[PDB]
Design a protein around this ligand. Structure first.
Ligand SMILES: *[C@@H]1O[C@H](CO)[C@@H](O[C@@H]2O[C@H](CO)[C@@H](O)[C@H](O)[C@H]2NC(C)=O)[C@H](O)[C@H]1NC(C)=O
Ligand SMILES: *[C@@H]1O[C@H](CO)[C@@H](O[C@@H]2O[C@H](CO)[C@@H](O)[C@H](O)[C@H]2NC(C)=O)[C@H](O)[C@H]1NC(C)=O
Lengths: 502, 502
């Protein structure tokens, strides 16, 4: 029902051959996009039906570089704009030149933060007749709007049935619904001219009815369809007797909604906030994980890429490789790029040697993502990560992937202890020699139904079956990571150390 | 500006000679009564000017058994009724026969919960002309009014200037201000007939304007002149990044107000509530006072009277004396009544012995109160509580006193280590042989300007001097709990053990 967006931000798809599959997995069934809705480099005739349930986008909506003549975003209602494209635009429609014809954002009626950028769409006909000041929030009138009207297409007139000559398309139902401007009273959203039609303060993007339950969208926090300023607290305060007591109606805060229980792969705080990182002076404990204060001073934590000093660091290099020595859990991500194993003439960074990768021998959990686009050609497997068990995926590469392996010379995967990909997708593609990709029970590693494995251009199964590469005769269910007795997922018989032995 | 309230609840004052002084100390300068405002057994021409600043009563207002002809409450605006007299009345005027002549509650325009009980006042005049349905809040329309109109007065007619014939008194100033039944709209409160004139949804008891600042009283939580559903939480939730952050605007919740720093003698909680007891699985600790969750199960905490199994226990007896064996800190109060030492044949309770009281040797701090109305006649002092340092007074006997000593044969106080009375008053009275009351530095023991020592019917200081029970010379500033060099509060020379030596 809820899903996270992508951080591609106009960059080219890493795997174009599976780009469409990634979007379908990320958005099939999703109603609330907790992030940016980015629809880019989509080919002509692409089946985008999976987008038809999306109602609310938390970040920005970026439609760009597409040849699809239409995008099925009709149900979409509110773009909160909590994250913006170029920092100024909540809806960005760029370089759709085949190409986008009608925006058809019929239900869109609210943009809480940010403007609109429609540029270089030689087939977009009706983007000029929309009165954007109605969609912008009562507190987002600073929203800049830059719309390019240079359209190659001969533009059909706005539909007769449509009023005010404001249309999202040529269809009669493509007519714009003007909520904010119509209000006679000083109310942000109204059903009509009459004062009674005015929506409750909490209501956003219009209300089907006056009561706060009837809002089409929630300004601050949805609660089972009851919009609220703040989620009900886990504990309430008694004014008479100065005591706090548990609240039976208390709910946890997750994104823009109220949840009865903290969703999987998130941390629940004592205040009731479901987060991805623990607050300051708090540590993650298991009871499901929660953030508990470190009454004793917090122990030294190994911070991965994306966190603290390593926030802007692109990859793991010889400069920062020793920072992960002895760390059994990394709060952050690990990325190995081509320049990781080469030297930078400017920054005087020596190349990473394969002997320096053994600092990850004790690594058991990564809270972010594992991204590998380069690997020492000496090593045929990701065996430095053999003792790695969990990739949480709280931080995702490009906003979508938690495990990505690009263009590697490895012959098999060495992640024999990997049991959980908490969140995100797996992208293993263009590894000409990698064989043991389909012998891994990815369904066992995935925790969410949106999660899937995207793979293309690896060593064909034919070649693996032909040259004798397969799971060992002692593997259970033919699940394994490599050619050896030490690479099985589950072993039929009693084990001798790592080795599975009859 | 704030003060607690008494829990006499129509019972006779323990010290009638000092009852009026008790009320003056509790209410002088106070504006918000966090508790019940009980004005009982006041004599004729009693000076009651200290009540003139009271605007808000958190609990109920009880005027009863008084001889004053007028009660000086004229700025009281709201009675929240969180605690009710007999569970049905937020205002009670009973048996004021001198005697009460006019209620004169000119500014009373809101009762959040509870009704009015006016009975047996043979001099009250204008209780009938008031429209009580106006004062009662819309939620509290269930409020039952039981008003007695049996009056032995030929009363001067209601002032013609006063409209609607609703008068709190004979003077033209005493017209009842209508704020709920003169409203053209659905607003709970209104300053005028016009619909624009109604008050904000958080406004209570009326308003001077349309905004939330204007309210005369706050419905839920006052925030420095601003009425809000809740105080700003100490932490706030970021939906984009899915994490909590510290809130500089965050406020601690104290009673019906929101404050920057937790008031003294109150427990701070992580959620931001200033409480008198810690929540479940939370232990008290020094940051001041704070309530921290215990990762391990919290250790065994001794519970005094009024807490847990001893919530309905009146006094410490032989039945429950051994529950305080080895206790260093008692959660609750300690009360020694005549039946504690006499015993109860009905329950087969054995009498307390002086040997049994030694279980308090290790007692250092009492969070509630210390009440002693009986004491063994073989013990000339309170040396059993020699090692007691702090009486917090979070629980107060009759809502006013944290240290009460009445009708005892002790010749001096043995509270050698007593350095702090956190809250409440001290009532030492009718101890004929007690010669060392005034030597003690009560001012250093108190932490509030509300606190004072109420003493009467104790051994006259002239008798003290004549018999020779003067302060020990080696004591400092003439501050001695008792005779001899061991009872000095501060010792001028170096201290040998507990004995001040030359
Ligand atoms: C608040 O959340 C609830 C539950 O997530 C939303 O109710 C759902 O709405 C859509 C309707 O297409 C579907 O996910 C389900 O049919 C509903 N689930 C229920 C009713 O349990 C509700 O719409 C949200 N409120 C707003 C304003 O979006
Ligand atoms: C909210 O609290 C503030 C104080 O924190 C109140 O302001 C005081 O109001 C009293 C009258 O009740 C005055 O005598 C004081 O001089 C005021 N002090 C300050 C600093 O303003 C305020 O009135 C409260 N709000 C309401 C609605 O009662």
């Amino acid at each position: 029902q809820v899903c996270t967006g992508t951080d591609m931000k106009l960059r080219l798809p890493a795997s174009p051959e599976t780009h469409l599959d990634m979007l379908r997995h990320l958005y099939q069934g999703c109603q609330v996009v907790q992030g940016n809705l980015e629809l880019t480099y989509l080919p002509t005739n692409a089946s985008l039906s999976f987008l038809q349930d999306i109602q609310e986008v938390q970040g920005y909506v970026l439609i760009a570089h597409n040849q699809v003549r239409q995008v099925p975003l009709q149900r979409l209602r509110i773009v909160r704009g909590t994250q913006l494209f170029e920092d100024n635009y909540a809806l960005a429609v760029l370089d759709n030149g085949g190409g986008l014809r009608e925006l058809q954002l019929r239900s869109l009626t609210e943009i809480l933060k940010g403007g609109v950028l429609i540029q270089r769409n030689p087939q977009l006909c009706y983007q000029d007749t929309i009165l954007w000041k109605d969609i912008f929030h009562k507190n987002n009138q600073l929203a800049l709007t830059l719309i390019d009207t240079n359209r190659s297409r001969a533009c059909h007139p706005c539909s007769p049935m449509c009023k005010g000559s404001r249309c999202w398309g040529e269809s009669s139902e493509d007519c714009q619904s003007l909520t904010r401007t119509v209000c006679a009273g000083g109310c942000a959203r109204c059903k009509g001219p009459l004062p009674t039609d005015c929506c409750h303060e909490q209501c956003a993007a219009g209300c089907t009815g006056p009561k706060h339950s009837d809002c089409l969208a929630c300004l601050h926090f949805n609660h089972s369809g009851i919009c609220e300023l703040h989620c009900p607290a886990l504990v309430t305060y008694n004014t008479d007797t100065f005591e706090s007591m548990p609240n039976p109606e208390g709910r946890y805060t997750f994104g823009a909604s109220c949840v009865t229980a903290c969703p999987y792969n998130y941390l629940s705080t004592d205040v009731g906030f479901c987060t991805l990182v623990c607050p300051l002076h708090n540590q993650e404990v298991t009871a499901t994980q929660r953030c508990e204060k470190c009454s004793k001073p917090c122990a030294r934590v190994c911070y991965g890429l994306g966190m603290e000093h390593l926030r802007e660091v692109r990859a793991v290099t010889s400069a920062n490789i020793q920072e992960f020595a002895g760390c059994k859990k990394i709060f952050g991500s690990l990325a190995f790029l081509p320049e990781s194993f080469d030297g930078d003439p400017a920054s005087n960074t020596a190349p990473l040697q394969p002997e320096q990768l053994q600092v990850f021998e004790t690594l058991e959990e990564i809270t972010g993502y594992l991204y590998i686009s380069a690997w020492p050609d000496s090593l045929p497997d990701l065996s430095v990560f053999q003792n790695l068990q969990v990739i949480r995926g709280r931080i995702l590469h490009n906003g979508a992937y938690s495990l990505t392996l690009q263009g590697l010379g490895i012959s098999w995967l060495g992640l024999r202890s990997l049991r959980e990909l908490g969140s995100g997708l797996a992208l293993i593609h263009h590894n000409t020699h990698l064989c043991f990709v389909h012998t891994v029970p990815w369904d066992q590693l995935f925790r969410n139904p949106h999660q899937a494995l995207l793979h293309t251009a690896n060593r064909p199964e034919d070649e693996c079956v032909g040259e004798g590469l397969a799971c060992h005769q002692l593997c259970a269910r033919g699940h394994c990571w490599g050619p050896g007795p030490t690479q099985c997922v589950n072993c039929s018989q009693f084990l001798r150390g790592q080795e599975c032995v009859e």
